[PDB]
């Protein structure tokens, strides 16, 4: 009766969704053919025959990666009216994804939403797997979110996004993407989510015993996070926290909606022993700086709000002693005027494995993330100091002052976390 649809924008989001719906089919026992040999209306719908289809929309301006789903192993799962392709990519040009090509096939993707919104009645959240690296994953992202608040307005819109890395950075105009996309995702998204590529590597290198990771394995870490956020809807625990509450819990002021995800425990197969993984053991590893997936030191700021989504085998009194430890420390410290800073969620379902006992997803809306914007503002100034690459965005119809209008917009964003940090 309760639903939560998903949209995938750009090439980086599709390869996230290739591992996500790989995991969801293994959750409810679904085959790649939509077949299984109760309450799962959030991510699936039933046909007239005994087949289930995903509530997913795959958009791309280049026809490459969607053919990898249209010819891959997960081929028969998807409705061919969902698989939407373009012809010419934005090709790491935000003005092409926002003005040139994305304005043409915008009619088809938005029409597929209401075709999914017929059978949905408990519409409780949206999923937009979009990166800020590629132009298609960013230029279409701004055009998509404008119509939905015109469409729904009151319904929830969540973005499990990918943060551009401060050191290991692939493309060139990746600093140009973030400042331009700021005005959309601060005025439409109810709670955006930042994940950096860079912190994943040492988690793969040290904690997962494989120094040289693959992008197939980078998606496996985030796919476990997205499932355990939905662990209250898809199942039944003693304390089920639905997605309406998170945007009401984690948001003290309606502009501040940038937490970070933290999955724990992250172990290897050989290190599955030499440990016991009690509920007090693993939550201290959550607040370890080298276990999070965002390159931000949590002891460089203060926590505004914290959330903990447990699964597996959990007794709350045993967690009650675990939370009592973290308030009674000193290197871990909160925003002082928020003394009630925990949101606990327990599900009695084990964390499934993709080819352990319990697992924790930590969601901490903190002030440690605010330094990451300043590391990216420093990138954007010098490339705009030369007026470099202006003839591509202006070459694809964009105002020069639209950079400058969004330039001060980050300063009003940055002064928020600075103001909340002091008493």
């Amino acid at each position: 009766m309760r639903e939560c649809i998903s949209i995938h924008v750009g090439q980086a989001g599709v390869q996230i969704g290739n591992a996500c719906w790989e995991l969801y089919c293994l959750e409810h026992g679904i085959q790649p053919d939509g077949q299984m040999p109760d309450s799962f209306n959030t991510f699936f719908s039933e046909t007239g025959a005994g087949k289930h289809v995903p509530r997913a929309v795959f958009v791309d301006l280049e026809p490459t990666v969607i053919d990898e789903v249209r010819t891959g192993t997960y081929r028969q799962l998807f409705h061919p009216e969902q698989l939407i392709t373009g012809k010419e990519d934005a090709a790491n040009n935000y003005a092409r994804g926002h003005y040139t090509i994305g304005k043409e096939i915008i009619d088809l993707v938005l029409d597929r939403i209401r075709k999914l919104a017929d059978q949905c009645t408990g519409l409780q959240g949206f999923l937009v797997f979009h990166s800020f690296g590629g132009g298609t994953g960013s230029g279409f992202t701004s055009l998509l979110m404008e119509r939905l608040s015109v469409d729904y307005g009151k319904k929830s819109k969540l973005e499990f996004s990918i943060y551009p890395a401060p050191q290991v950075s692939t493309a060139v105009v990746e600093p140009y993407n973030s400042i331009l996309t700021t005005h959309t995702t601060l005025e439409h998204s109810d709670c955006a989510f930042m994940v950096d590529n860079e912190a994943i590597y040492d988690i793969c290198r040290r904690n997962l015993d494989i120094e040289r990771p693959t992008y197939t394995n980078l998606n496996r870490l985030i796919s476990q996070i997205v499932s355990s956020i939905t662990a209250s809807l898809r199942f039944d625990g003693a304390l089920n926290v639905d997605l309406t509450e998170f945007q009401t819990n984690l948001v003290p002021y309606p502009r501040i909606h940038f937490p970070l995800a933290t999955y724990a425990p992250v172990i290897s197969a050989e290190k599955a022993y030499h440990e016991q993984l009690s509920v007090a053991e693993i939550t201290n590893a959550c607040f370890e700086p080298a276990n999070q997936m965002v390159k931000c030191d949590p002891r460089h700021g203060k926590y505004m709000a914290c959330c903990l989504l447990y699964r597996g085998d959990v007794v709350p009194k045993d967690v009650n002693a675990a939370i009592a430890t973290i308030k009674t420390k000193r290197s871990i410290q909160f925003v002082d005027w928020c003394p009630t800073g925990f949101k606990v969620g327990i599900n009695y379902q084990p964390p499934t494995v993709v080819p352990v006992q319990r697992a924790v997803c930590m969601l901490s809306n903190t002030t440690a993330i605010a330094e990451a914007w300043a590391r990216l503002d420093h990138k954007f100034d010098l490339m705009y100091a030369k007026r470099a690459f202006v003839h591509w965005y202006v070459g694809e119809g964009m105002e020069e002052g639209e950079f400058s209008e969004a330039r001060e917009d980050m300063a009003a964003l940055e002064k928020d976390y600075e103001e909340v940090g002091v008493d």
Binding site: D236, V315, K317, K327
Partner: protein, 429 residues
């Protein structure tokens, strides 16, 4: 006669009633189906007060189950004692309150309230004589905060003489399971101080303590967390459902205890409590049941009676027992803790003796306490309110529902009006 209509709300309070009606099932020999299997004919003599005897050897729980999402209603009907209820009475919404008081009281509270107030009317018409209404919910969630408090003001508009008791859990002192637990307390404080006749107040942390201090448990489940309140609620009306050497009911407990209508916020107490094997190495008699009550640790609300002053004391016993073994114990303990009480009441110990024990041990006692220790918890809660209010955070949700600061401020002032009055009689002696 004098039948009682049961209303639930929230998500915590439903699972308590999911255990509480199991307690009433074996306190009346009621099977999980709905038929009867008891042997003692004292059950059938007053069976009507918590059960409608339906047609054809049936008994249904006179209870109104209320939620705002179909999950918890599914969990009750699938597990134990779910088919015993009437499927007509599973009256529940589809949205979920979102852990907002204003969603449970203004927007989504107005929807399902009409479906409930006919069911309240259908049971109150069907009852021969009506005694009072009881409510089990939360003060931390959304559905337990707004939806239950919206009902009681409509019921006080209906019935002036009928009593009302809420077994509402106090928001937690130190652990913070709810992020907005002041915003679910303070907006719920104002409804409770106006038109609730007596109000039960249970801290979370002491319930963890009593399950750990006396019993010494390792993995306490909510089937054993919330079970202590289920025996507690049964001990309130256990003199109603069966005869005694000194009977009692919900009106006798009200007028004896509450000295002024703004001071009616009570604390429980239960005895005896053992371990699984450490149960025989103790003289489990009346003086052991005497001194097990009056200590600080037995209170399910975490408060020190040493840091406060009592006003009145009720005590409900169960099982056959003598009297001077009780009465001198119920007299002398006022003299050893002499300065802890207040001056202006002679013999503030109300005694109640039923003649039916629990299904189990031979004798049992239920303590109902009233003291000035609870107001010191609210000064923390008023601090927890103002800490999230001196920056005026979390307002745009309630602004999105529509509410001025004065409704927050006067309820905080009315919370301070509770502060100004439990301190007033405490300062007096």
């Amino acid at each position: 006669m004098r039948e009682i209509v049961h209303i639930q709300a929230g998500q915590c309070g439903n699972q308590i009633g999911a255990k509480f009606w199991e307690v009433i099932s074996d306190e009346h020999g009621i099977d999980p189906t709905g038929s009867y299997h008891g042997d003692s004919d004292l059950q059938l003599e007053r069976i009507n007060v918590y059960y409608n005897e339906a047609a054809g050897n049936k008994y249904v729980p006179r209870a109104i189950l209320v939620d705002l999402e179909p999950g918890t209603m599914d969990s009750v009907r699938s597990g134990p004692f779910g088919q015993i209820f009437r499927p007509d009475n599973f009256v529940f919404g589809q949205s979920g309150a979102g852990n907002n008081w204003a969603k449970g009281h203004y927007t989504e509270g107005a929807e399902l309230v009409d479906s409930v107030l006919d069911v309240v009317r259908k049971e109150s018409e069907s009852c021969d004589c009506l005694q009072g209404f009881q409510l089990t919910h939360s003060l931390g969630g959304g559905t337990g905060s707004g939806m239950g408090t919206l009902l009681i003001s409509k019921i006080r508009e209906e019935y002036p003489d009928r009593i009302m008791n809420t077994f509402s859990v106090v928001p937690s002192p130190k652990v913070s399971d709810t992020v907005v637990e002041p915003y679910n307390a303070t907006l719920s404080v104002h409804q409770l101080v106006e038109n609730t006749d007596e109000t039960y107040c249970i801290d979370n942390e002491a319930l963890y303590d009593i399950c750990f201090r006396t019993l010494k448990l390792t993995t306490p489940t909510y089937g054993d967390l919330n079970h202590l309140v289920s025996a507690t609620m049964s001990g309130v009306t256990t003199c109603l459902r069966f005869p005694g050497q000194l009977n009692a009911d919900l009106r006798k407990l009200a007028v004896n205890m509450v000295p002024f209508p703004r001071l009616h916020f009570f604390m429980p107490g239960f005895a005896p409590l053992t371990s699984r094997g450490s149960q025989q190495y103790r003289a489990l008699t009346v003086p052991e049941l005497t001194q097990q009550m009056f200590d600080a640790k037995n209170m399910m609300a975490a408060c020190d009676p040493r840091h406060g002053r009592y006003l009145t004391v009720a005590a409900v016993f169960r099982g056959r027992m003598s009297m001077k073994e009780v009465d001198e114990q119920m007299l002398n303990v006022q003299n050893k803790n002499s300065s802890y009480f207040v001056e202006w009441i002679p013999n503030n110990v109300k005694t109640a003796v039923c003649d039916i024990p629990p299904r189990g041990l031979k004798m049992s006692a239920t303590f109902i306490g009233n003291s000035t220790a609870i107001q010191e918890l609210f000064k923390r809660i008023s601090e927890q309110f103002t800490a999230m209010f001196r920056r005026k955070a979390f307002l745009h949700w309630y602004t999105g529902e529509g509410m001025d600061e004065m409704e927050f401020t006067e309820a905080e002032s009315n919370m301070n009006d509770l502060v100004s009055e439990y301190q007033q009689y405490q300062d007096a002696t």
